[PDB]
Amino acid sequence: DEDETTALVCDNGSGLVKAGFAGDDAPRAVFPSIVGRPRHQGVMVGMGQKDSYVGDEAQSKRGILTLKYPIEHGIITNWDDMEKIWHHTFYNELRVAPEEHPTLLTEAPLNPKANREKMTQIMFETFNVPAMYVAIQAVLSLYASGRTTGIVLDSGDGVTHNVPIYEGYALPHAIMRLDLAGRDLTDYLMKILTERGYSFVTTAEREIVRDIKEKLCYVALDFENEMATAASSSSLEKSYELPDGQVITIGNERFRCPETLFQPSFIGMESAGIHETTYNSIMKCDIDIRKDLYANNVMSGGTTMYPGIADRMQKEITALAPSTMKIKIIAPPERKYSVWIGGSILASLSTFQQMWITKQEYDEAGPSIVHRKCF
């Protein structure tokens, strides 16, 4: 722990938890949001026999544990799970006590306010944090980009959000949430791999196939033409070496998996591709600034490490929108940490401690005070 009473910066992103100290450039403890529980009961002795397993421990013990998600698309299952994982993060991973450091947290867009009220109340009772602040990840990604104008595409693991912000002001009237995310990607890839001869249901293979998505997946420039040329495609077809050692070969599926977000009709969504969701979002607001929105679009999330989103994005928007002004996307490398960086940025300036949510305000007005203290 630093000698100074600097604040805690924790991004509880929908899919990854990244925690550390204020003034740091990158979060120190970063772990996926999976939680493992003993698949069977206790009869043995001498070691183990522990209920909750979180972090890399559960990653190593994936096979023996039922792998469960305490949060999915924002919905909260069991607050005890968050209690334990926050205990682990603060003491076993961050080696910090929350008594002496206020916490800045980031929440999923439209994370529920009622959800806010319960989580804040359990937090304040269970923990002894001196002060509090929670913010939407959209403005955090904006801060990471450091440009007040643009539309943020937050692609988490449970929801994809499109949020327009012009000159550093939020536009909730033109903000939308789409239920397509990593979960859907894994599902669709699971069914295609089932049609390829490999049919698995458990979560270990879920992580294997999301790793495959991280490594080999394409974003098709032209879809049906690329499957037409991918009929044989000995060179274009790509293989992976699974940890057991078998060589699993995939061809068109590499660019037929992310295409589900672009073409939701593959597995039955009324909503069109996410580019349509950015398009409608843009036109809902006044006409004039729309061009700037076209030229200032930002994309954020862990998924963004994949190739192909930028070219597809620009081409389709130019197809939909007039091609007079030039559209260009901006995306700094390793932007999944960017939100946490913005949290540090919030703690950088000396005005931030004017609106810390202190203990006594919550003791006076209950959780309801946040309704007036954040917004």
Residue with Cβ nearer its own copies (323 or 360) = 323
Q: How many angstroms separate the CA atoms of 299 and 4, rounded?
A: 35
Q: How many angstroms separate the CA atoms of 77 and 85, rounded?
A: 14
Alpha carbon 180 to its chain centroid, in Å, reads: 12
Q: How far is the CB of 248 from its own copies (least distance, A)?
A: 10
Contact call for residue 319 and its own copies (CB under 8 A): no
Residue numbers after which the chain is interrupted (C to N above 2.5 A) read: none
Q: How many angstroms separate the CA atoms of 65 and 63, rounded?
A: 6
Q: How far is the CB of 208 from ligand ADP (least distance, A)?
A: 12
Residue with tokens 């990244």: 18
**Partner in contact with 295, chosen from Mg ion, ligand ADP, other proteins, none, beta carbon below 5 to 8 Å by kind:** other proteins
Q: How many angstroms separate the CA atoms of 100 and 6, rounded?
A: 8
> Which helix (H) or strand (E) segment is 357 a member of?
strand 357-358
Give the binding site for Mg ion (CB under 5 A): 154, 156, 301
Q: How far is the CB of 331 from its own copies (least distance, A)?
A: 23
Q: How many angstroms separate the CA atoms of 210 and 185, rounded?
A: 8
Tell me if 304 sits within 8 A of 335, measured CB to CB. Answer: yes
Q: How far is the CB of 138 from ligand ADP (least distance, A)?
A: 10
Give the count of beta carbons closer than 10 Å to the beta carbon of residue 338: 24
User: Which residues pair with residue 299 across a beta bridge?
Assistant: 153
Contact call for residue 295 and other proteins (CB under 8 A): yes
Q: How far is the CB of 202 from other proteins (least distance, A)?
A: 26
Site for its own copies in 20-49 (CB under 8 A): 39-40, 43-48
Residue with Cβ nearer other proteins (40 or 326) = 326
| Contact string (CB under 6 A) for ligand ADP, positions 307-336, x = contact | -----------------------------x
Residue with tokens 């004017």: 354
Contact call for residue 351 and its own copies (CB under 8 A): yes
With left for phi above 0 and alpha for psi between -120 and 50, is residue 197 left, alpha or beta? left
Residue with Cβ nearer other proteins (227 or 295) = 295
Residue with Cβ nearer Mg ion (156 or 251) = 156
Contact call for residue 216 and ligand ADP (CB under 6 A): no
Site for its own copies in 53-82 (CB under 8 A): 61-64, 66-67, 73-75
Site for its own copies in 146-175 (CB under 8 A): 148, 166-169, 171-173, 175
Contact call for residue 149 and ligand ADP (CB under 6 A): no
Among 8, 9, 10, 13, binds ligand ADP (CB under 6 A): 13
For residue 212, give Cα distances in angstroms to 103, 187, 339.
35, 13, 25
Q: How many angstroms separate the CA atoms of 14 and 310, rounded?
A: 22
* Four-point Cα dihedral 53, 59, 63, 64, nearest 10: -20
Q: How many angstroms separate the CA atoms of 300 and 354, rounded?
A: 29
Among 332, 345, 359, 373, binds other proteins (CB under 8 A): 332
Contact call for residue 16 and ligand ADP (CB under 6 A): yes
Residue with Cβ nearer ligand ADP (15 or 70) = 15
Residues in touch with ligand ADP (CB under 6 A): 13-16, 137, 154, 156-157, 182, 210, 214, 300-303, 305, 336
Interface with other proteins (CB under 8 A): 295, 325-326, 328, 330, 332-333
